């Protein structure tokens, strides 16, 4: 299971979704209610640290797994307007994420495309939650096809 | 009813495909319109703001907010279309110095808003954090008498809206320096703050 | 056997190191008393602590296991405690470099980073000797693990190393590597005394506030 979020510049979320494998019909045992918002706000610190630097620990829009913490692989992405696309990776065992950078980088690219399609609405201003079910339908089909 | 400010939903991956409702191509088709129609909408903008405002200053800030609401849109659209959709792309530089986002403006923004590239772009010798962006002929506002400068703030309202949302907060004012054969030349100067500069003071 | 007498001499050497390091406390300002089991001079107990540290390091290297790296930590502790006052212990530094290059690999020549390299090497001895008999003393005979002092090892490392980073543009210690050395800090950690947990999370709050890592 994976918790996905898009966070504003003034530390607020515009999108949040949690999606799991169907074998575990309930997902993230006891971490979901308490741990997963807090470790994401913790990772916002180090994503804010690496946004301004030149040579990382190329092209600065994607970046790798940013930390590893209670066996959870936390993967980020930084848009052009400053939005941050932090999405974590859970499993009962340890998880490999770097092998999916052929696929998950593309996933971040077309969800960036979806966010640009959201932003081009003149009615939708920033610091608003993305209250659209069509956006949910596209991001869960992209979650299915980029598993 | 998907994302409120109240909770997060949990739904399984690899389930059924849901319905298809709305979609659109992000890449631009090449569309053209007359200069007269956009000039008419521009003077109607300035006429309504002349009608519903008292003095010059808050009129200028309201016009700059009008430009801001194009600029914060326009940043991600131009960078995403300069990176290249469903077609395989990647991700531009996402530039983070001061001296190359102004290069990005003078190259791509003015050649996107207008047919022509922006003319000159120089620094200030007398002081740092002051940058000159200059054209020779403003095609937004060529239809007003030249002694008023406040109607020229809309386009620099774009530029502040291009800059503050990109991570470099700043402030812009515009003046008219009648140099050479061009009677209207329209310098826009960009005043940054100290808190960005020492940031790139920290980065060697 | 020679192992039992060598282990007893190593225990007496560690006790001599801890006592002679504890002998040079409160700077010996006007300590001209009878001085039972002490020297109580200007720099005598620091030098005797250095000699006992060299003998303890030699005995622990000869006995090549949690007690081995305690003298390696105590040599840097003696060097730092003497360096709070005036100190010129380059001969003891050369003896520590020789013993640490014989056993471990030093590969460092920086001012006040050799102590951090020695502590990072000193964690590895307890890390290797973790898979052993769990109880070896009697004061922890009904304990659970040696994690209860394994956390005190790297917290006194973080306390002695995070103050080296003053805020400035040339920083001797980068924020990223000590943040990622605090990354693998979070072990099992659930059941422990509550005073230990409030103090150890107060130290993590202290180093994060001084680092600026606010969230």
Curated annotation (Swiss-Prot), chain A:
UniProtKB keywords: Autophagy, Endoplasmic reticulum, ER-Golgi transport, Golgi apparatus, Transport
Alphabetical list of Gene3D superfamilies matching this protein: 3.30.450.70
Tagged with keyword Repeat: no
Compartment(s) where it occurs, according to its Swiss-Prot or TrEMBL record: Golgi apparatus, cis-Golgi network; Endoplasmic reticulum; Preautophagosomal structure
Record's GO cellular component terms: cytoplasm; cytosol; endoplasmic reticulum; nucleus; phagophore assembly site; TRAPP complex; TRAPPI protein complex; TRAPPII protein complex
Keyword Endoplasmic reticulum: yes
Pfam families hit by this protein: Sedlin_N
Gene Ontology terms describing biological process: endoplasmic reticulum to Golgi vesicle-mediated transport; intra-Golgi vesicle-mediated transport; macroautophagy; protein-containing complex assembly; retrograde transport, endosome to Golgi
Domain of life: Eukaryota
PANTHER family: TRAFFICKING PROTEIN PARTICLE COMPLEX SUBUNIT 2
Function: Component of the TRAPP I, TRAPP II and TRAPP III complexes which act as guanine nucleotide exchange factors (GEF) for YPT1. TRAPP I plays a key role in the late stages of endoplasmic reticulum to Golgi traffic. TRAPP II plays a role in intra-Golgi transport. TRAPP III plays a role in autophagosome formation.
Assembly and interaction partners: Part of the multisubunit TRAPP (transport protein particle) I complex composed of BET3, BET5, TRS20, TRS23, TRS31 and TRS33. Part of the multisubunit TRAPP (transport protein particle) II complex composed of BET3, BET5, TRS20, TRS23, TRS31, TRS33, TRS65, TRS85, TRS120 and TRS130. Part of the multisubunit TRAPP (transport protein particle) III complex composed of BET3, BET5, TRS20, TRS23, TRS31, TRS33 and TRS85.
Family statement: Belongs to the TRAPP small subunits family. Sedlin subfamily.
Record's miscellaneous remark: Present with 1200 molecules/cell in log phase SD medium.
Protein name: Trafficking protein particle complex subunit 20
Organism in which the protein naturally occurs: Saccharomyces cerevisiae (strain ATCC 204508 / S288c) (Baker's yeast)
Gene of this entry: TRS20
Curated annotation (Swiss-Prot), chain B:
Tree of life domain: Eukaryota
Entry GO terms, CC: cytosol; endoplasmic reticulum; phagophore assembly site; TRAPPI protein complex; TRAPPII protein complex; TRAPPIII protein complex
Protein name: Trafficking protein particle complex subunit 31
Assembly, per entry: Part of the multisubunit TRAPP (transport protein particle) I complex composed of BET3, BET5, TRS20, TRS23, TRS31 and TRS33. Part of the multisubunit TRAPP (transport protein particle) II complex composed of BET3, BET5, TRS20, TRS23, TRS31, TRS33, TRS65, TRS85, TRS120 and TRS130. Part of the multisubunit TRAPP (transport protein particle) III complex composed of BET3, BET5, TRS20, TRS23, TRS31, TRS33 and TRS85.
Gene3D superfamilies listed in its UniProt record: Trafficking protein particle complex subunit 3 (3.30.1380.20)
GO biological process, one term: intra-Golgi vesicle-mediated transport
SUPFAM superfamilies per UniProt: Ligand-binding domain in the NO signalling and Golgi transport
Additional facts recorded: Present with 8350 molecules/cell in log phase SD medium.
Record CDD domains: TRAPPC5_Trs31
Chief localisation class: Golgi
UniProt source species: Saccharomyces cerevisiae (strain ATCC 204508 / S288c) (Baker's yeast)
Listed InterPro entries: NO_sig/Golgi_transp_ligand-bd (IPR024096), TRAPP-I_su5 (IPR016696), TRAPP_component (IPR007194)
Keywords: Autophagy, Endoplasmic reticulum, ER-Golgi transport, Golgi apparatus, Transport
Described purpose of this protein according to its UniProt entry: Component of the TRAPP I, TRAPP II and TRAPP III complexes which act as guanine nucleotide exchange factors (GEF) for YPT1. TRAPP I plays a key role in the late stages of endoplasmic reticulum to Golgi traffic. TRAPP II plays a role in intra-Golgi transport. TRAPP III plays a role in autophagosome formation.
Subcellular location: Golgi apparatus, cis-Golgi network; Endoplasmic reticulum; Preautophagosomal structure
From Swiss-Prot, chain C:
TM stretches of this protein: none
Record's miscellaneous remark: Present with 259 molecules/cell in log phase SD medium.
Gene: TRS120
Protein name: Trafficking protein particle complex II-specific subunit 120
Subcellular localization, as worded in the UniProt entry: Golgi apparatus, cis-Golgi network
Organism taxonomic ancestry: Eukaryota, Fungi, Dikarya, Ascomycota, Saccharomycotina
Modification Phosphoserine occurs at: 66, 74
Organism of this sequence: Saccharomyces cerevisiae (strain ATCC 204508 / S288c) (Baker's yeast)
Role: Specific subunit of the TRAPP II complex, a highly conserved vesicle tethering complex that functions in the late Golgi as a guanine nucleotide exchanger (GEF) for the Golgi YPT1 GTPase. TRS120 plays a role in the YPT GEF activity of TRAPP II in concert with the two other TRAPP II-specific subunits TRS65 and TRS130.
Residue numbers of the full-length protein present here: 265 to 528 of 1289
Disulfide bonds: none
Quaternary data: Part of the multisubunit TRAPP (transport protein particle) II complex composed of BET3, BET5, TRS20, TRS23, TRS31, TRS33, TRS65, TRS120 and TRS130. Interacts directly with TRS65.
Protein family membership: Belongs to the TRS120 family.
């Amino acid at each position: 299971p994976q918790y996905f979020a898009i966070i504003g510049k003034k530390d607020n979320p515009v999108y949040e979704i949690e999606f799991t494998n169907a074998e575990n019909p309930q997902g993230f045992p006891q971490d979901l209610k308490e741990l997963n918002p807090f470790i994401l706000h913790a990772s916002l610190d180090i994503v804010e640290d690496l946004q301004w630097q030149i040579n990382p620990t190329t092209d600065n829009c994607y970046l790798g797994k940013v930390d590893h913490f209670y066996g959870l692989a936390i993967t980020a992405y930084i848009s052009y307007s400053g939005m941050k696309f932090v999405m974590i990776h859970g499993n009962s065992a340890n998880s490999s994420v770097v092998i999916d950078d052929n696929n998950m980088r593309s996933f971040y690219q077309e969800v960036h495309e979806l966010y640009v399609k959201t932003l081009m609405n003149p009615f939708y201003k920033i610091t608003d939650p993305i209250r659209s079910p069509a956006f949910d339908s596209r991001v869960r089909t992209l979650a299915r096809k980029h598993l | 009813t998907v994302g409120p400010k109240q909770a997060i939903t949990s739904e399984a991956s690899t389930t059924y495909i849901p319905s298809r409702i709305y979609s659109e191509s992000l890449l631009f088709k090449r569309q053209e319109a007359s200069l007269s129609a956009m000039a008419f909408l521009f003077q109607e903008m300035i006429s309504q703001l002349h009608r519903t405002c008292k003095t010059a200053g808050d009129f200028e800030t309201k016009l700059s907010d009008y430009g801001h609401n194009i600029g914060i849109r326009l940043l991600e659209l131009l960078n995403f279309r300069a990176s290249s959709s469903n077609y395989i792309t990647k991700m531009r530089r996402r530039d983070l110095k001061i001296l190359d986002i102004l290069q990005f403006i003078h190259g791509t923004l003015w050649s996107y808003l207008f047919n022509h590239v922006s003319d000159d772009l120089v620094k200030s010798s007398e002081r740092d954090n002051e940058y000159m962006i200059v054209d020779n002929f403003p095609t937004l506002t060529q239809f007003i008498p030249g002694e008023n400068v406040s109607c020229e703030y809309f386009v620099c309202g774009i530029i502040k809206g291009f800059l503050f949302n990109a991570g470099f907060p700043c402030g812009v004012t515009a003046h008219r320096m009648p140099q050479g054969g061009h009677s209207q030349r329209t310098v826009y100067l960009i005043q940054f703050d100290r808190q960005v500069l020492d940031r790139e003071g920290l980065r060697f | 056997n020679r192992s039992q007498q060598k282990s007893l001499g190593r225990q007496m050497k560690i006790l001599g190191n801890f006592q002679l390091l504890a002998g040079r406390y409160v700077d010996a300002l006007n300590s001209f008393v009878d001085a039972i089991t002490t020297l109580y001079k200007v720099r005598d107990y620091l030098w005797l602590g250095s000699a006992l540290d060299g003998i303890s390091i030699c005995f622990l290297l000869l006995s090549y296991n949690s007690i081995s790296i305690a003298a390696m930590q105590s040599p840097r502790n003696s060097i730092m405690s003497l360096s709070a006052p005036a100190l010129n212990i380059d001969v003891e530094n050369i003896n520590l470099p020789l013993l640490i290059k014989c056993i471990s690999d030093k590969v460092l020549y920086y001012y006040d980073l050799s102590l951090m390299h020695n502590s990072e090497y000193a964690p590895q001895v307890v890390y290797c000797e973790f898979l052993l008999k769990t109880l070896t003393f009697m004061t922890s005979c009904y304990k659970s693990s040696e994690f209860s002092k394994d956390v005190l090892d790297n917290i006194v490392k973080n306390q002695h190393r995070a103050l080296s980073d003053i805020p400035n543009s040339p920083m001797f210690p980068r924020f990223e590597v000590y943040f990622y050395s605090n990354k693998l800090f979070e072990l099992q950690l659930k059941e422990m005394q509550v005073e230990a947990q409030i103090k150890i999370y107060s130290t993590m709050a202290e180093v994060y506030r001084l680092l600026g890592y606010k969230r």
